[PDB]
Amino acid sequence: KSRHTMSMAPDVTREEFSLVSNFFNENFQKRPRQKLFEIQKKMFPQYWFELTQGFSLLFYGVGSKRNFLEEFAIDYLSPKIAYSQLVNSIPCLILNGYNPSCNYRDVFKEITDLLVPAELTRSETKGNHVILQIQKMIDFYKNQPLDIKLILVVHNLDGPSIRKNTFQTMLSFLSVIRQIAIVASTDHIYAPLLWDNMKAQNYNFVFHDISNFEPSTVESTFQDVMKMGAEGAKYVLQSLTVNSKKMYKLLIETQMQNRGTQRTGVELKLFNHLCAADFIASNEIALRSMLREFIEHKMANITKMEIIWVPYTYAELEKLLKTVLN
Amino acid sequence: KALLQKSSELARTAEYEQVMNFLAKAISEHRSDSLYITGPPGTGKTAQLDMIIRQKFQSLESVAVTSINCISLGEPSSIFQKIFDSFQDLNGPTLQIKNMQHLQKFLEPYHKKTTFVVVLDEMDRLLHANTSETQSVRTILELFLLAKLPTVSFVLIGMANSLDMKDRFLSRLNLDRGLLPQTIVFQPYTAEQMYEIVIQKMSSLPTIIFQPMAIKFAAKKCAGNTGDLRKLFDVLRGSIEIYELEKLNYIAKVFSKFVNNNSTRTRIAKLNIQQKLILCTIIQSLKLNSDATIDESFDHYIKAITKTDTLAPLQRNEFLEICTILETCGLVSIKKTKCKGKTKRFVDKIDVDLDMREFYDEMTKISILKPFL
Amino acid sequence: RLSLISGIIARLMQTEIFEEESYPVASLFERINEELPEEEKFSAQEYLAGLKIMSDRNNLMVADDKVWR
Amino acid sequence: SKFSFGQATPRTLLGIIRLSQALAKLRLADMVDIDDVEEALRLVRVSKESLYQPTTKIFTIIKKMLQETGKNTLSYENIVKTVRLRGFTMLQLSNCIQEYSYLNV
Amino acid sequence: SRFENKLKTTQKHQIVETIFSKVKKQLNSSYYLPARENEFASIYLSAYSAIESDSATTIYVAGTPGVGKTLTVREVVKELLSSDFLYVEINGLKMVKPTDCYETLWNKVSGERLTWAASMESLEFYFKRVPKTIVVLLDELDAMVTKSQDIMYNFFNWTTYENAKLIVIAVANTMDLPERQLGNKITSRIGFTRIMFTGYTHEELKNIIDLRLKGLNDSFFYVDTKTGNAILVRKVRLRMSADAIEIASRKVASVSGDARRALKVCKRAAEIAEKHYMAKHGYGYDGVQTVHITHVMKALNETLNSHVITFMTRLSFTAKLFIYALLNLMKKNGSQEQELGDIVDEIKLLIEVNGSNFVMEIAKTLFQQGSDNISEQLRIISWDFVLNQLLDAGILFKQTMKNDRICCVKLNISVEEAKRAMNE
Ligand SMILES: Nc1ncnc2c1ncn2[C@@H]1O[C@H](COP(=O)(O)OP(=O)(O)OP(O)(O)=S)[C@@H](O)[C@H]1O
Numbered sequence A: 001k002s003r004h005t006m007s008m009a010p011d012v013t014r015e016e017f018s019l020v021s022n023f024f025n026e027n028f029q030k031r032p033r034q035k036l037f038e039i040q041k042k043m044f045p046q047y048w049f050e051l052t053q054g055f056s057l058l059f060y061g062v063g064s065k066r067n068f069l070e071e072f073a074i075d076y077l078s079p080k081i082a083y084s085q086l087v088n089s090i091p092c093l094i095l096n097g098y099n100p101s102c103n104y105r106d107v108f109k110e111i112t113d114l115l116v117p118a119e120l121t122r123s124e125t126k127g128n129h130v131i132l133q134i135q136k137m138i139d140f141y142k143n144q145p146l147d148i149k150l151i152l153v154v155h156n157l158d159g160p161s162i163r164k165n166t167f168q169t170m171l172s173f174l175s176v177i178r179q180i181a182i183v184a185s186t187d188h189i190y191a192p193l194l195w196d197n198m199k200a201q202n203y204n205f206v207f208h209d210i211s212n213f214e215p216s217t218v219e220s221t222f223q224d225v226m227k228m229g230a231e232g233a234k235y236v237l238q239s240l241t242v243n244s245k246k247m248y249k250l251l252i253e254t255q256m257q258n259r260g261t262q263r264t265g266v267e268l269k270l271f272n273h274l275c276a277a278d279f280i281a282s283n284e285i286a287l288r289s290m291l292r293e294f295i296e297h298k299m300a301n302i303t304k305m306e307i308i309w310v311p312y313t314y315a316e317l318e319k320l321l322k323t324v325l326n
Numbered sequence B: 001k002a003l004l005q006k007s008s009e010l011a012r013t014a015e016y017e018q019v020m021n022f023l024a025k026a027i028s029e030h031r032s033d034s035l036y037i038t039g040p041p042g043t044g045k046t047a048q049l050d051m052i053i054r055q056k057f058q059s060l061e062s063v064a065v066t067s068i069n070c071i072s073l074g075e076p077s078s079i080f081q082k083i084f085d086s087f088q089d090l091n092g093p094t095l096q097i098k099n100m101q102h103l104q105k106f107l108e109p110y111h112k113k114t115t116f117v118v119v120l121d122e123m124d125r126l127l128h129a130n131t132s133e134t135q136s137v138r139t140i141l142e143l144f145l146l147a148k149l150p151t152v153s154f155v156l157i158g159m160a161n162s163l164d165m166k167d168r169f170l171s172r173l174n175l176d177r178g179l180l181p182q183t184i185v186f187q188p189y190t191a192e193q194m195y196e197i198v199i200q201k202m203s204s205l206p207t208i209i210f211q212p213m214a215i216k217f218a219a220k221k222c223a224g225n226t227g228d229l230r231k232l233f234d235v236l237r238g239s240i241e242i243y244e245l246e247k248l249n250y251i252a253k254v255f256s257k258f259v260n261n262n263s264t265r266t267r268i269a270k271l272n273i274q275q276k277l278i279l280c281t282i283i284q285s286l287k288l289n290s291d292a293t294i295d296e297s298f299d300h301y302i303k304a305i306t307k308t309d310t311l312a313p314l315q316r317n318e319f320l321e322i323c324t325i326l327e328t329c330g331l332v333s334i335k336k337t338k339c340k341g342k343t344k345r346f347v348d349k350i351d352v353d354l355d356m357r358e359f360y361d362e363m364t365k366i367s368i369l370k371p372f373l
Numbered sequence C: 001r002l003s004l005i006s007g008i009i010a011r012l013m014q015t016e017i018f019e020e021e022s023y024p025v026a027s028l029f030e031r032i033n034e035e036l037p038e039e040e041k042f043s044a045q046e047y048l049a050g051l052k053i054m055s056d057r058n059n060l061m062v063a064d065d066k067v068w069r
Numbered sequence D: 001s002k003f004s005f006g007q008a009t010p011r012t013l014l015g016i017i018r019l020s021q022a023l024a025k026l027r028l029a030d031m032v033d034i035d036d037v038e039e040a041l042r043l044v045r046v047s048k049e050s051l052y053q054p055t056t057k058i059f060t061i062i063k064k065m066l067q068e069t070g071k072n073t074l075s076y077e078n079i080v081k082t083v084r085l086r087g088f089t090m091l092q093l094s095n096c097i098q099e100y101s102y103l104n105v
Numbered sequence E: 001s002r003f004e005n006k007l008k009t010t011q012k013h014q015i016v017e018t019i020f021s022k023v024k025k026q027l028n029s030s031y032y033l034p035a036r037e038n039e040f041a042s043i044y045l046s047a048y049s050a051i052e053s054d055s056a057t058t059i060y061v062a063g064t065p066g067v068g069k070t071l072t073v074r075e076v077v078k079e080l081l082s083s084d085f086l087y088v089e090i091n092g093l094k095m096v097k098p099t100d101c102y103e104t105l106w107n108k109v110s111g112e113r114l115t116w117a118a119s120m121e122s123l124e125f126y127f128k129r130v131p132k133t134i135v136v137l138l139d140e141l142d143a144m145v146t147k148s149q150d151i152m153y154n155f156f157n158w159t160t161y162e163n164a165k166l167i168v169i170a171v172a173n174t175m176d177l178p179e180r181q182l183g184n185k186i187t188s189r190i191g192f193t194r195i196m197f198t199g200y201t202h203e204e205l206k207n208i209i210d211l212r213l214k215g216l217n218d219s220f221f222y223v224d225t226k227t228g229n230a231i232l233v234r235k236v237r238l239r240m241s242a243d244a245i246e247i248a249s250r251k252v253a254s255v256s257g258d259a260r261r262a263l264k265v266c267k268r269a270a271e272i273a274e275k276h277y278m279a280k281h282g283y284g285y286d287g288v289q290t291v292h293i294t295h296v297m298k299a300l301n302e303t304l305n306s307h308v309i310t311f312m313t314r315l316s317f318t319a320k321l322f323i324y325a326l327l328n329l330m331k332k333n334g335s336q337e338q339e340l341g342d343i344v345d346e347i348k349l350l351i352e353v354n355g356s357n358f359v360m361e362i363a364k365t366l367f368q369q370g371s372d373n374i375s376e377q378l379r380i381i382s383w384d385f386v387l388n389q390l391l392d393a394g395i396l397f398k399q400t401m402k403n404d405r406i407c408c409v410k411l412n413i414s415v416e417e418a419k420r421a422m423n424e
């Protein structure tokens, strides 16, 4: 099974990747991107009018929408609605769904403090009373004068914590209230698996496409691939004793004398004698103790001759030869 | 003769010259360079920064710069409590030290507008705390953010053992952000900066403090795997009492404690020829590389001793005592391993520190184990 | 030249004839002119300067001249 | 196994009894002592050994033997030499070798 | 302290101090040492320097239990009271929770009862602020290492402060402990002193016995012939045969080198002669005596020899019927672990494969206790009982399943001795 693999790739370090990535995402398709941004700007009065009807507005589409939501929520809408009702403008409570550390307790503790504490609602705070406390919020809000006092934003609604099911139903009861406007965005292709006709009854979602093919700068940070071990032990050797460099150099030679697999490895006895030959290893214990340091940071393997072999590729070890060992 | 060597056991370093350049704005009251000070362990690095700040505080203008040790927290609140302890004041502490935005209100000084720099000691307890991208990396993320607009900024100086922590940073943070960039490392001083400090730490000099080339010999042949030469002088301070007890001599005394029984003193452990027989009996049971019970070993011990009649078959209770004679010398270890039938039930699996190469030499001299091989 | 003659001393430090990292000066002379390589042995200062290069390579030391630590 | 041959039969026990009777007949005695059986068993075991080419006192004697060189030898030619002049046979000390190996001496 | 006044009572009706009673008084494990003589100095000269110079060091000793490391360091501090310190026995295993030792230290500086949290704050506040003396014994260090090493880092980080008036003394089980459980960052702080304690040797094991037998070996007692009471009518003597004491030494030094094990096997062998002396004359509880070699021959063997072989032949019939079926499956299949229903399948089959013989009086009783009225039992009589009896005995082992057929059974003792004891 001769497969080309990501290990057999010309790799790129940390500062080299992120800088040339920053060059593309700020200079690749710049002119048509704001050219799209001016086209969709005329839809902004249409969103203002429908949002008076308490409609949970939901934005789908390819690409990141994070920049677009923050322009649309903060600068455009939130002072426009305060001027049209008649003083600080309408409070914006974003929810970063790409941040996995969102819970149901903490954000709702913000909500009841963002909303009015007209009564002693801490008396009803008791043991899951969250649905209980919001139910007492809802029926009171059915008989209030209709005006928006809060707009909340939920970025990346299919996020790693917001897509949890006890959190989803929590947002469902918020959306039936007329005083708050719910402007959220998702990115998943299976996002309408999240809602049944029970929740969408509470939601009354409407949909709009926004596809600007954004790079998702902030949304790439928490995500990881093998760019983010061959690269792990690449830094430990840069800070050690000078003898460990030499005893790894003698290790890496005869382990690449023969991918870097088990079969190219060496026996412990002769390697003790080999590192006794260059006046390096005194005995087995002095060898093994500064070999456990290569073991503790998982920089070498052993299987069974008593074969110690390096788990990095054929291409990687000669890169480890000519750069850091030399 | 005691008082010369009673005093033996107790600007100054050539690494302090680096950090004053790295604190080049700390005497002009501006924000200094970006300080993430790491190190391989034992390299003096805990007391290294402690040497700098104590020389900073004894030198230094209103003077208030505090340092706390992150050991017993697991949680980012009470650090911002301990910076309040240099004020000797009173406030509402709990909310202000909890949230990211709550720290920002705390950074408005009172008496004379001297900027503050914090020192985070032993940051690796919080790095190597609870799960990374949930709490601890977020804790790392939140502390290194210095986007504050006045020059009164909480400059971090944190420290760590293992150097994986930089690659653990997110790609936004690695875009030249905060205290990142100057990853000032400290290679372990072989003898060329640490021994000379010992020389100046021999300011009060006795006459016979030994041939110093042997001290140089001590430094050269300890620098294979070491970081603390005063502690490796604390092994000279033990051997200097050896020449008081007798009214690298000791490293020679300590390695023969560790190297032996495989080459020579294996037969010291087995003066009994049956102890030689029972030691080969363990390795013959190791063919089935299983949980090597004291019974499965006793199974192969009987079924071989009925074939070759070298001795009578002995008791299991005798088999219990004889394998413990193999135990106390340090050859074979016994552990109560896992079998999960009814409860966590403990059968005893053994493990041998001998090889067949170091076996075959000591058995060809005795042709009575030669039937057994 | 220098790698081979020290390489004999490696397997001759593998045995306990020096008993420690200490070794006498007569232990050297019974391990150069007694052992296998003939006429490679340099002058009285030169292979005595040759063992300095090993000390400069920090693998073996010279001390208390009747012995060497 | 590999070097084995035959098994123990009751005819061999009867032959051991007959050889002990022949050894007692050669000493012209009316009774069979303990010295004949230990000689006959040694005879029948050394007859096949060429293919490879009452205890406390004995323990005390071994200790006395040790009080000279301190040697734990496996097979004996000069330990047994101080035993036959006393009154005990070659078979009693033969058990004292194996038993005592449990003392690891 | 307080209640030892209340632990005393009055009426003590003249207890008979026999011959071997006064032996066991000094054969108690309580009351300069011969074996670890010079190593006492190696601790003390390491300790005397730091004490009279106001520093902070660490001393690490290891060894198997029974070698005096509980004892020797107590003898270090004991003479030091004659010549500035606060002695604490911070035992590891005597702490219920591992954090509870923190409470003791803050208690043993001023007398306050504070948090393990709140203690170590003020402890850290002590160890870097006080202008200028504390001896602490961190015994049995396997206990306080287990959770996440955050406790063990503290106890050596306090040593690093040059303004810390503390002297720590660690005593472990193994020298390996800061290399197979701790990190290297602790292993830098542990130092490289590493004073090894070996076992005792059998010559010194003679030299430790007579220290207890100082004023009583081959001495004389004053005895009335009526009650068996001895006083340090006859005037008798009691001698100890030193060769039997020697053969006690040559075993215990061989297997363990344990100083409790040497004393206690002499203590066990002492009371064997006690009851045999009381058997022959009967002085109850209200020419020249000795202790034979034959006493320590039994008592040393009494440490070894078992009874599970004697237990098995003294069990019930259906117990021995059970194991004989169980080895039959293990030689049929060679899988050492048989399903429970197959054993019930076998004990049915092991009836009729034997002939029509005693077996019928068995087979009548094996399925009904007489009583031809009630019969036709599927599994045998008391089959739950013997299987429960073999379970709590430790001979058998049966994994937990609600199915009473496919639950596996595993042997727990060696199956050959099970085969061997079955033969009787
Ligand atoms: N160059 C030096 N100058 C002055 N004191 C030194 C020097 N090197 C070592 N020391 C002292 O010897 C000690 C040995 O360092 P350690 O504290 O054991 O290691 P460290 O200081 O904890 O750094 P780590 O292990 O990376 S946290 C230091 O704490 C100082 O007290």
Ligand SMILES: Nc1ncnc2c1ncn2[C@@H]1O[C@H](COP(=O)(O)OP(=O)(O)OP(O)(O)=S)[C@@H](O)[C@H]1O
Residues within 6 Å of the ligand: E029, E030, E033, E034, E035, E036, E064, E065, E066, E067, E068, E069, E070, E071, E072, E208, E211, E259, E260
């Ligand atoms: N050299 C000795 N001289 C006199 N009595 C001794 C000697 N060695 C041990 N003992 C006694 O035997 C007891 C054995 O306890 P220790 O050996 O001190 O404990 P230990 O070796 O630490 O084993 P532990 O505590 O379970 S780790 C001591 O309490 C003394 O009563």
